[PDB]
């Protein structure tokens, strides 16, 4: 019994975002993981009141130190970061990431959680610190808004997303999965590679289901990562992840919370319902 | 999509105790639940270093108020409490329990987490506050040590457990599941009812597996509750829970952490491998 994944992200007592999505998904795939929380909130930030607090830097340090000293993180092969409430935790996480990647190969999926629909959810300080964190990632999974905040570019189309991805590839980021770009009544996902010699950029066109959903990007991150962990090539891992997500959303009533608990039996679905379209 | 369970207990980032056990188990049974944390620790207290902190009262209140204002707790039918690091959180929980039980029937399983092997985990302040919290429970699930701390009586045998259960039943507690009493190389579980006219007290004898395990009582609590939620009579819920736990332990290699992740497919097991033994009520017939 060794921990294979370390995931650092938010926690909500009720509903499904961040590490709570991560727990549900990684537990269902039976991938032994460490879940370090960055918040302890009653519910997600979409509600009118959001009780509870961000995790304090000293407690985060204490936790990370304890995992190291007790050798509980020695065998980590995969790292995920999500939501941070404050930049101090982001800068500390950068120090930890550098250390974790020094003694072994560790695949780091950075899921920057900053906003949606052109608006910032997160405390504004976080943005700049996230621009630094992403530089250590093997893959990043922003939505279009987040891509815009990480580059300063408008991202209102695939072409604009391509240009913004270039900026980040030039900083060294090998892979960028832009999880949603509005195109009419479809959502386009774009997968862009720094190394186009050995990888083919692609899009996937997803018909929009009515509603603005919360935790969908987090759910994608963890289903995707789970399949990557299970040895599935990236193209297929993405297609499975988006396909399973369509199933979850078709079975979700309202938009406050995704129906992930009831859908646990279908999380390991292998249906690849979409076409991989090469640019 | 409504939250059916509210569970208030500890959290570890790595390994399996308290609400982390609860998440794994209740998620696997697809029982939509609220998991309010009372700690955020790196790992359980068994390790040489235990990083992180207890949840502060003001944050706990902020969380509980937010659940209420956003109407996320309106449909709760089941309540579980586990580990508390400090008495302030216990007294506040009592307030929340009373409120939650005022507008609807809510089944409250109180799992007092105080200690084991005759020794205390908790600050002495917590014990006294737990003596008040248990009075609101429909069922409690202490080990023998915890029963002794809640009553001030020694509990070294089934007869002793019966005498200590009396004290708590006289305070109004309807059901007491004493999860472990040492008897040779067996563990005896005792289920004791305040109302012995309409319920039958029983024991189950469990062969000890070598090791002192962490999170086992927590795991029992959430498997038992899940089957109660699914409508299984208590006797059968207990037998399934103890049976599933033996399977987990037989398949656990260390004693550091129970093998619950690999055992997720067996958590909804319906095998009832032990014998329910009905006993004579009165302490003087035993032990
Ligand atoms: N309204 C919707 N209709 C269909 N699919 C959706 C919808 N919202 C999200 N998704 C799916 O969820 C994935 C992630 O959603 P997205 O909104 O990009 O994440 P975030 O939560 O970061 O904003 C998308 O790639 C898509 O597969
Ligand atoms: N060493 C062991 N061998 C076999 N079963 C055990 C052992 N430890 C615990 N159990 C099982 O787990 C259940 C709960 O254990 P217990 O020690 O009472 O919980 P805790 O002390 O964590 O509150 C017991 O009723 C028993 O079925
Ligand atoms: Mg979105
Ligand atoms: Mg994302
Ligand atoms: Mg014990
Ligand atoms: Mg117990």
UniProtKB/TrEMBL annotation, chain A:
Statement: the UniProt record of this protein carries the keyword Thylakoid: no
GO molecular function term, any single one: pyridoxal kinase activity
Superkingdom, natural source: Eukaryota
Record keywords: ATP-binding, Kinase, Metal-binding, Nucleotide-binding, Transferase
EC assignment: 2.7.1.35
Residues annotated for pyridoxal 5'-phosphate binding in this entry: 10, 45
GO process annotations (BP): pyridoxal 5'-phosphate salvage
GO cellular component terms attached to this protein's record: cytosol
InterPro entries per the UniProt record, alphabetical: PM/HMP-P_kinase-1, PyrdxlKinase, Ribokinase-like
Residues the record lists as binding Mg(2+) 1: 111, 141
Segments forming domain Pyridoxamine kinase/Phosphomethylpyrimidine kinase: 92-254
Binding site for ADP: 143, 179-180, 209, 211, 217, 246
Residues binding Mg(2+) 2: 116
Gene3D superfamilies to which the protein is assigned, alphabetical: 3.40.1190.20
SUPFAM superfamilies according to UniProt: Ribokinase-like
One Pfam family in the UniProt entry: Phos_pyr_kin
Family: Belongs to the pyridoxine kinase family.
Stated name of the protein: pyridoxal kinase
Originating organism: Entamoeba histolytica (strain ATCC 30459 / HM-1:IMSS / ABRM)
């Amino acid at each position: 019994m060794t921990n294979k994944v370390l995931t650092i992200s938010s926690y909500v007592c009720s509903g499904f975002v961040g590490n709570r999505c991560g727990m549900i998904i990684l537990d269902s795939f039976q991938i032994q993981s460490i879940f370090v929380l960055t918040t302890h909130l009653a519910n997600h930030t979409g509600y009118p009141v959001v009780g509870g607090s961000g995790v304090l830097l000293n407690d985060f340090i204490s936790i990370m130190d304890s995992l190291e000293v007790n050798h509980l993180d020695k065998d980590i092969e995969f790292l995920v970061t999500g939501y941070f409430p404050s930049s101090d935790l982001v800068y500390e996480t950068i120090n930890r990431v550098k250390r974790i990647k020094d003694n072994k190969k560790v695949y780091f999926l950075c899921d920057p959680i900053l906003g949606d629909n052109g608006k910032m959810y997160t405390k504004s300080e976080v943005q700049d610190s996230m621009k630094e964190l992403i530089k250590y990632a093997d893959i990043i999974t922003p939505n279009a808004t987040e891509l815009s905040f990480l580059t300063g570019l408008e991202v209102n189309s695939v072409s604009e997303a391509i240009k913004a991805c270039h900026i980040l590839h030039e900083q060294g980021i090998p892979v960028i999965l832009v999880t949603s770009i509005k195109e009419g009544n479809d959502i386009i996902l774009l997968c862009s590679f720094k190394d186009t010699l050995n990888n083919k950029n692609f899009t996937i066109k997803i018909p929009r289901i009515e509603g603005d959903f919360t935790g969908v990007g987090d759910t994608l991150t963890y289903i995707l990562l789970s399949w990557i962990i299970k040895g599935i090539p990236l193209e297929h891992a993405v297609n499975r992840a988006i396909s399973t997500l369509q199933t979850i959303l078709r079975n979700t009533v309202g938009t406050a919370e995704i129906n992930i608990i009831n859908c646990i039996p279908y999380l390991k679905g292998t249906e690849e319902s979409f076409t991989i379209t090469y640019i």
